[PDB]
Design an enzyme around this catalytic site. Sequence first.
Site, PDB file in Angstrom:
ATOM      1  CE  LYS A  23      -4.486  -1.024   0.067  1.00 43.27           C
ATOM      2  NZ  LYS A  23      -4.178  -2.436  -0.305  1.00 43.27           N
ATOM      3  CG  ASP A  68      -7.508  -2.702  -2.242  1.00 47.29           C
ATOM      4  OD1 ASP A  68      -6.946  -2.363  -3.308  1.00 47.29           O
ATOM      5  OD2 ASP A  68      -6.869  -3.111  -1.261  1.00 47.29           O
ATOM      6  CG  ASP A  69      -8.938  -0.368   1.563  1.00 47.09           C
ATOM      7  OD1 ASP A  69     -10.023  -0.968   1.722  1.00 47.09           O
ATOM      8  OD2 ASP A  69      -7.901  -0.756   2.143  1.00 47.09           O
ATOM      9  CG  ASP A  77      -2.581  -3.477   7.816  1.00 51.36           C
ATOM     10  OD1 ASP A  77      -3.533  -4.042   8.387  1.00 51.36           O
ATOM     11  OD2 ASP A  77      -2.533  -3.337   6.558  1.00 51.36           O
TER      12      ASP A  77
HETATM   13  C1  LIG Z   1      -9.140  -7.163  -1.026  1.00 51.34           C
HETATM   14  C2  LIG Z   1      -7.915  -6.566  -0.440  1.00 51.34           C
HETATM   15  N1  LIG Z   1      -8.158  -5.215   0.035  1.00 51.34           N
HETATM   16  C3  LIG Z   1      -7.842  -4.813   1.284  1.00 51.34           C
HETATM   17  N2  LIG Z   1      -7.210  -3.698   1.503  1.00 51.34           N
HETATM   18  C4  LIG Z   1      -6.763  -3.624   2.914  1.00 51.34           C
HETATM   19  C5  LIG Z   1      -5.362  -4.199   3.117  1.00 51.34           C
HETATM   20  O1  LIG Z   1      -4.405  -3.311   2.531  1.00 51.34           O
HETATM   21  C6  LIG Z   1      -5.098  -4.393   4.625  1.00 51.34           C
HETATM   22  O2  LIG Z   1      -3.802  -4.959   4.853  1.00 51.34           O
HETATM   23  C7  LIG Z   1      -6.166  -5.338   5.174  1.00 51.34           C
HETATM   24  C8  LIG Z   1      -6.007  -5.667   6.648  1.00 51.34           C
HETATM   25  O3  LIG Z   1      -5.923  -4.481   7.452  1.00 51.34           O
HETATM   26  O4  LIG Z   1      -7.472  -4.740   5.003  1.00 51.34           O
HETATM   27  C9  LIG Z   1      -7.849  -4.358   3.697  1.00 51.34           C
HETATM   28  S1  LIG Z   1      -8.173  -5.821   2.679  1.00 51.34           S
END
Ligand SMILES: CCNC1=N[C@@H]2[C@@H](O)[C@H](O)[C@@H](CO)O[C@@H]2S1
Lengths: 444, 443
Positions: free
Chosen positions: A40, A116-117, A227
Amino acid sequence: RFLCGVVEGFYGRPWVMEQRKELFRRLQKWELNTYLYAPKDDYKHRMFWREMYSVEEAEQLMTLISAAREYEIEFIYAISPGLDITFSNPKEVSTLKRKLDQVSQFGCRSFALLFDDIDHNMCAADKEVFSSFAHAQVSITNEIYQYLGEPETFLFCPTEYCGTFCYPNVSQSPYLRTVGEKLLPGIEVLWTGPKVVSKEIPVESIEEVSKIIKRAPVIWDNIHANDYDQKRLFLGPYKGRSTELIPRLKGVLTNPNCEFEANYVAIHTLATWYKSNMNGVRVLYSPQMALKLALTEWLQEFGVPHFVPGPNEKPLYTAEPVTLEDLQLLADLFYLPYEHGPKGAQMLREFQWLRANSSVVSSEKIEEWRSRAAKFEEMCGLVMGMFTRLSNCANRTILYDMYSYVWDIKSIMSMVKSFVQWLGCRPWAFRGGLAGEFQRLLPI
Amino acid sequence: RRFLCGVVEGFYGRPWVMEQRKELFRRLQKWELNTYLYAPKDDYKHRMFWREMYSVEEAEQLMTLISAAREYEIEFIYAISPGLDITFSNPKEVSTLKRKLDQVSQFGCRSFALLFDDIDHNMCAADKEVFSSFAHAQVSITNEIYQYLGEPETFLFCPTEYCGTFCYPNVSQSPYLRTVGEKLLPGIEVLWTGPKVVSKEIPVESIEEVSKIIKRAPVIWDNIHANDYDQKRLFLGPYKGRSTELIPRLKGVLTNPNCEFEANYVAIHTLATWYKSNMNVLYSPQMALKLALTEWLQEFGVPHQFVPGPNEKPLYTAEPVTLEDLQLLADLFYLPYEHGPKGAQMLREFQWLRANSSVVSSEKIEEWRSRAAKFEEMCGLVMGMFTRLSNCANRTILYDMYSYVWDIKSIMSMVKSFVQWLGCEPWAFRGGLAGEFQRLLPI
Ligand SMILES: CCNC1=N[C@@H]2[C@@H](O)[C@H](O)[C@@H](CO)O[C@@H]2S1
Ligand SMILES: CCNC1=N[C@@H]2[C@@H](O)[C@H](O)[C@@H](CO)O[C@@H]2S1
């Protein structure tokens, strides 16, 4: 053709190249096969996804990708443009093509686009060209996929990547419906289960998502991710995933703890789980047995770098090495996101009982308390013993990754012990900083 | 002249690496400080395996490090910590210590230290026959080592009773300290951390009191910015609670700062401002913080061109870190016994909001709504601060701070969310097993 391995997909300090190459060696040893590059906060992966690698950076990534090839590990390069890509701008699509072709020239043959996110609201310009956010993502994923020559491995991470992120639910999502209809069949989709950090991934939850995205998903498993909570570390075994999922999936990529050397159990047990039903179709894996198998192997790494005192002389402080029982204890204290290991749960339960019955020191049940107290003091003693021996181990690299966690638990356990001793008679007070004072005011 | 001021790498956990140590020397010189004390608790050949000589590879790195100190006009002081393990009465054991220190002497090091902090007070049988107390035992080998090395100009001793609260029965009557002050050779300096391990204040009278029993002025080993004892904590507030009047009553101040190297810009910069202010009313902590943060800010835009239209998605990375972001961050991660003004203010507002929350269910509803919205904005500034840090060009600084800044942003978002809930599942059990034991302690 099952993708099983590790995604470096977490927030914070990425792994360095030396560590990534050592991952490839461990994945091969344990008969796993895949690495997904998606840190990330590695700047040119997400925030500055537009910027091409320098000559220095190019050399390091080439070297890394050749190392993957040498260890028979598939290298999958991910890119995350969704914070600020204008999807409708062909200049912007070209910039994405340029970046991925630069990585292609380093020898990489497998790729991924991640969405994502990011927030679901498009800019004006994109809302005139595409009827929804899903159409926009799917359009450029499809265009990128075919520009790269329809590579055998290409992954797509949806914005709605887990049960609870699906509006209004998984089976009726307009976002997912569009993905499953329009995303080219050669492309795989990532999914994390019912939740971001799924306690269980039931088979029926995967049937449900499979029929709407119209493929089997690759799982991006966050069971051992850490994290999101600074105090937490996960050394428990891979758990809550039936081996019956394996025939219903294209893969499982685990997104493990940030601290590289803490992922021995996380990755080792995943390998044990995959190997147990590698060729199933439509009781093979025991988490507890797998933890033990992983910890026995990990133990051998602690004695490897990365005068005899008389009868009445001060004995060596450093004489006693880490034991299997120390690592069993440590793992139970830093086990899994929704469960502590047996010893941790047992200590916690004993301390609660001791405190709740503590007014009986001030006649029959006193010997119950004294005996239970002493048994509890011994257990706290083993936590300090475990810390002490770790502190003295020859593998300094492993020690440093674990250190602040092991210090923390030892420190608190000593203070709890001290408190039970204090019950049996009758400097750092703002513990956790400002964050901690806000937490104490929330519900629990 | 001859005041030791600078930094001791004296904490538990991951030591600094050589690249970081050399960069420390450059910063100490820039800010007109002069001393570095090598004492990393968990660098294996400093304490646990103090007996073992450095390898050829290790020796080369320490030679290089010591030459770098010399080049930056920084005195390099090598400490060793034998107290977990040493049989004081065994001349073999004394020789082994001599061997190690002359190995370091051959790397170019001219200044040394023996540390006896954080070890239990009980001697072995053999040492109890030769020495009548723990203090006599330490003082005997410190004295012998000191004279073997030719009575070097700088030689420090760290006592087992190194702060007010560690002194049995008190500082002025301690049999341990009395023996140190009588028997430790006058050329040797003594380290002290104030009334406590982590002292809120170091009053002048506390230093008069210790000075008369050890019979010298002490060198302070200051733990105000140390963070090895609480994994959630970080200290970016200014050097504070030590009068400039201490300077003439001390031989030095060595700060033992945060483990995360890049977090110590404020810690060390303000210490330098404090020493300079009364080297021979003078020092304002708040003014010094500001001076340090404005200088630190320039590091964030330095590593270690699409222009979006009127209706296109704007660049995520456009806005750089500002002075007001670092002022906010510092107030959230300020000092061990105090939060900075903004943190205290947010905390106070949230407590008020929660305690008056039943008024949503006539006159003072507008008080709550208005105070709520003002509080949501402040939580918004915390996320803004995180977001811009996350985008900065100095990745090395970002990575050291990251998990702290994520944590505060994350909690502040959750508090905000809760205030909104007062109007109109994956990480609720925060802090693991450690945290569940804490919640049961009395607080
Ligand atoms: C389908 C993957 N997308 C996701 N983006 C995030 C990850 O960067 C984190 O490490 C994880 C756990 O905190 O939570 C979400 S899961
Ligand atoms: C000068 C006396 N020695 C000391 N030993 C410890 C240090 O290693 C820690 O960093 C500090 C803060 O936790 O606490 C004590 S102070």
